[PDB]
Amino acid sequence: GLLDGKRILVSGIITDSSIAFHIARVAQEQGAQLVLTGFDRLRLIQRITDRLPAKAPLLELDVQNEEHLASLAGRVTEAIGAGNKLDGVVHSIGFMPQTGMGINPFFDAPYADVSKGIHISAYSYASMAKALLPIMNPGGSIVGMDFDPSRAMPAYNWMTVAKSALESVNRFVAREAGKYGVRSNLVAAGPIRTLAMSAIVGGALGEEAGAQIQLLEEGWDQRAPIGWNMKDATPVAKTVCALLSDWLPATTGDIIYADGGAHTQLL
Amino acid sequence: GLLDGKRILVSGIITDSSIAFHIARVAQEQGAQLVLTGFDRLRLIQRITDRLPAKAPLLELDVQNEEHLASLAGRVTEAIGAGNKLDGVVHSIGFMPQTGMGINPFFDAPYADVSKGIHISAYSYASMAKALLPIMNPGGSIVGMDFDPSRAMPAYNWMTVAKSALESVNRFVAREAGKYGVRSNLVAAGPIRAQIQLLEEGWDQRAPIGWNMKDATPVAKTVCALLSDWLPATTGDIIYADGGAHTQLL
Amino acid sequence: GLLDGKRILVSGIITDSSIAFHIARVAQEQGAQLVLTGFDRLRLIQRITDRLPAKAPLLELDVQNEEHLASLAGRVTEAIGAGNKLDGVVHSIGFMPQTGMGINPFFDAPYADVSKGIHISAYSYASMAKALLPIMNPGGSIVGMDFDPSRAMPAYNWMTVAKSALESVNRFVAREAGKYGVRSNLVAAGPIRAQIQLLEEGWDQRAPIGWNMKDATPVAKTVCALLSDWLPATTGDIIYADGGAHTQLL
Amino acid sequence: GLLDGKRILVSGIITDSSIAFHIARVAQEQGAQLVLTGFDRLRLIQRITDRLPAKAPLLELDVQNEEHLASLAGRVTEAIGAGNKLDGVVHSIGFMPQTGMGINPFFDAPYADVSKGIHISAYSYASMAKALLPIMNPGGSIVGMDFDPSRAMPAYNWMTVAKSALESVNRFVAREAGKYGVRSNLVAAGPIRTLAMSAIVGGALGEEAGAQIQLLEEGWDQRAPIGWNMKDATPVAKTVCALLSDWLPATTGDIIYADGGAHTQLL
Ligand SMILES: NC(=O)c1ccc[n+]([C@@H]2O[C@H](COP(=O)([O-])OP(=O)(O)OC[C@H]3O[C@@H](n4cnc5c(N)ncnc54)[C@H](O)[C@@H]3O)[C@@H](O)[C@H]2O)c1
Ligand SMILES: NC(=O)c1ccc[n+]([C@@H]2O[C@H](COP(=O)([O-])OP(=O)(O)OC[C@H]3O[C@@H](n4cnc5c(N)ncnc54)[C@H](O)[C@@H]3O)[C@@H](O)[C@H]2O)c1
Ligand SMILES: NC(=O)c1ccc[n+]([C@@H]2O[C@H](COP(=O)([O-])OP(=O)(O)OC[C@H]3O[C@@H](n4cnc5c(N)ncnc54)[C@H](O)[C@@H]3O)[C@@H](O)[C@H]2O)c1
Ligand SMILES: NC(=O)c1ccc[n+]([C@@H]2O[C@H](COP(=O)([O-])OP(=O)(O)OC[C@H]3O[C@@H](n4cnc5c(N)ncnc54)[C@H](O)[C@@H]3O)[C@@H](O)[C@H]2O)c1
Ligand SMILES: Cc1cc(N)n(Cc2ccccc2)n1
Ligand SMILES: Cc1cc(N)n(Cc2ccccc2)n1
Ligand SMILES: Cc1cc(N)n(Cc2ccccc2)n1
Ligand SMILES: Cc1cc(N)n(Cc2ccccc2)n1
């Protein structure tokens, strides 16, 4: 398998539609031994991770919690065993309150909400790198999840702002990670219709919000020379696994686009 | 004059070395009538702005203060007279605590420091556009100050992260500004006054026409070019006033 | 005037709809004294340029003709008078045979067609800079015309490829221009007049301040802004005069 | 192996220092069945390809020759056998006469030399795609070799111009390739000291040219958070193999940087 013998920490599983759920699934299919981290609802997360091909210890991690971060390395060390290290780290954590993305006007998002969004979505990529680099093997790899923020797009609002910050954090994390022989990269994925986005499409935020996501999806599939299936996270999961492998050994501080080539085309 | 009869708001003057002092000075030289804003040290700022070629009312604005933002348009309206609107807005506001910018390791900047820095340097660009667009004329222009964050670099650290967020906020501000027939753009300047020195000195070497980090005038003139009617099809964009250093690898 | 007393060379006029005709017109309105260049149909071009606000000598220049290039500086020198130099040069020259641009499949453009297109649209930018830099004043400015080629699109095909090569040539021209204290920049314009129509109409929708493909004036004004002294720290760069369409995804 | 059962055409082998030689070597190590193409000196090329882990049919291909292009698909079909198709295409062909890159001033390169350089380096990426797409399987992959031309750099001159054109050609090739379910991408590599560059370092083009390449190499290794070894093409070869695999299935019309992360850093 592509990741045979590799010890990989994977964060961000909340539902079986989570991009992380599919990263974990494909990583296990490729012979990786995983350590999973979950936020808040750990009983629910355990029930979700029970749906994976194989068993994996599950650790609690709230990236806004300093105690969880200060203890993370020792907790990982305990789960994988003394004398062992992590070969890979997957950051698949993203959040922005409704006030910062959706139908709320861009100017009406309060800074508390935007700052919480940027803490979890951008700053936490450096926090996790800081906590895990000392327990990472040389040749190691850290992958974060990006959504192309190069051009402004309706609805995404402050989440697009958080992704621009994340892109910058990634290049600085690469400088630190390099000292440990570790690579740091982001995967910029096309839109994925998780349980949450399926509710917006249905109308949880009103008919205007639904139509906004319906138009994005259509446009993305049209633009992509190989097409784009919003319901399938496998292509994105495989790209993350490719960055976790030894098959992109000279790529760091960079962004790999798993978007069907949509960002390279105007129409 | 290039900005003849234009009413322009200029924020960010702290010393006569501030880029905003040079923007203010060049704008006044080009016939603009100014409204200035100052943070925290308003008596100190008034003595600095006395050194400007012409008189300009000075208003207080702490970008982290919601009361200052809610009252900003009304206060500028009093200062420029009822039935008068702004043609230009200059955002020359930036800050990052020392833990997130300089010799401090990147990983050791607490989030409260990074957030305060992002609030002032990036969020406030949208805050000032929200407050002032309702008192802006069509053909109007909003200009922000940027330091190229496309590549990582020593020392600038979390300020580079805030500039990446600012470039994103600018694209969204342009979307809102458009409805008012107003442009929103950033000026990416070269640095203005061992790892830091080599990083800084690399700008002159790299720049095909050179770079003088002691001369803020080329950057001030670029801001005024965006504030004029001479770039009317440019919005949500970045204009590099860096000697062309960003276009050369060596 | 913005270009008061400046001596500027303007190439690329063919009809009164040519972007170069509008650059010429705006430059003359801003006090510039022009020298024009024309290709192949010099009698036709003279009648078009009579419609300009002021008189300007017209010279022949086939960018594919080495003799025209070798004699260009000497001929401009006669036209502007001995001991006088150019302050500005406008390259508004482009061409791609129909096999490489439009309805023809991308793969069916023979290399001779693509090469002729690249020679005229990209190589000639370096050719004109080589010929004219020796007769340019410091503080001088060279401006080229670009159509954003960062993303592929229907129809433009091999012209998009030539624009990608032009953006690269511009960065190298800036390196040489620098020695003469001269700037080199491109203006990336939005399109000026079923797959093509949707591609074109998408500019207005995308542009936060809008886009009028019938009005070449915003692009002409942007060229003049680069030709002025108001963007003196910008070189080897691209200025987008496209309504800000390139900064918006939808 | 990563490319087990895959039929891949690899062009651009001239010496055992060629980036293509190492692409081929790593591809064979990963279970790929290769078809090689070579320009002009085919006896010499056969002697070089004899140094590879396994045997591979060798076809003649001069990308400036229309007859070689019109016959390429049928010649490949003959070598791999009736009923079989190509899964991958590697374009590793680049040329620019000395007048267009090195010590010659940028303005002194004649258009004939620049046009020849752009024909072989940029146009030929579309010519090969046009000739090989009809004999390519769905899920197929075409990879070309790029050298980051985003910023002007001394010495590279018109070769940097040719690479900017190639980057644009790649996005248009992706539009065509997509119709056949095929991906098209470029690998932007850091500098590799092939036999030719080793001669420039030694002084074949004068002392000024050598110092120019000596400064580039040093700067690239310093800038890269994981470092850069100009004498090693393996990291670049592995990245090309990663694009030839099914592990980057949603990436097309794009550029993957195998440069040690140098382009993401200023100093
Ligand atoms: N869904 C898309 O269309 C899309 C597209 C591109 C990128 N992404 C990115 O992919 C990543 C995964 O998101 P997803 O789309 O799978 O949605 P998701 O809701 O399934 O996953 C995001 C995760 O963030 C976690 N999280 C939130 N706050 C946290 C905290 N304080 N501490 C720790 N974890 C916390 C949640 O528990 C959840 O597991 C995110 O970075 C997201 O921004 C999503
Ligand atoms: N000097 C450089 O090297 C350089 C280069 C590129 C961009 N810039 C940018 O130019 C702008 C001005 O920088 P400068 O070099 O003139 O420095 P400066 O110190 O003169 O200006 C920064 C200004 O921000 C103001 N400010 C801080 N906190 C504030 C708050 N809460 N509310 C309102 N105003 C607040 C300060 O009072 C000060 O006037 C900033 O956006 C900066 O990031 C500077
Ligand atoms: N119109 C648009 O949609 C648009 C958009 C962006 C950029 N541009 C660019 O603007 C420039 C002018 O385009 P335009 O729209 O005004 O079209 P145009 O037809 O008016 O101008 C092109 C000019 O190139 C000249 N030319 C052709 N071959 C030549 C040669 N061998 N030697 C010298 N001159 C030669 C022609 O005589 C003509 O005047 C070109 O570089 C074009 O690519 C056009
Ligand atoms: N060497 C570097 O530092 C470096 C860096 C980045 C990218 N590249 C690119 O990698 C690719 C391979 O180059 P390399 O560095 O291995 O050098 P190389 O000399 O070993 O390979 C280039 C190949 O181009 C072939 N070629 C030239 N003209 C041809 C024609 N008419 N028809 C067919 N083939 C022709 C040559 O025969 C040779 O095999 C090129 O695209 C090059 O531009 C090289
Ligand atoms: C870019 C993007 C799209 C989606 N769904 N996410 C994750 C997320 C989770 C919670 C709130 C907001 C966003 N990120
Ligand atoms: C990019 C840049 C350079 C400088 N001096 N600034 C402003 C600033 C003000 C206070 C603290 C930190 C930074 N921004
Ligand atoms: C980008 C663009 C659009 C137009 N009209 N041009 C000039 C041109 C002239 C002749 C043939 C083809 C193109 N360039
Ligand atoms: C970018 C780059 C570096 C090297 N050596 N090449 C290949 C090449 C082959 C012949 C002549 C010129 C260049 N491409």
Numbering used by the authors:
A (entry chain A), D (entry chain A): 3 to 269
B (entry chain B), C (entry chain B): 3 to 195, 213 to 269
Paper's wording?
Isoniazid (INH), a successful frontline TB drug for more than 50 years, targets the NADH‐dependent 2‐trans enoyl–acyl carrier protein (ACP) reductase InhA. This is a key enzyme in the Mtb cell wall synthesis pathway and does not have a human orthologue. InhA inhibitors are known to modulate the tertiary structure of the InhA protein binding pocket, in particular the substrate binding loop (SBL). Herein we describe the screening of such a library, in comparison with other fragment sets, against the highly validated Mycobacterium tuberculosis (Mtb) target InhA.
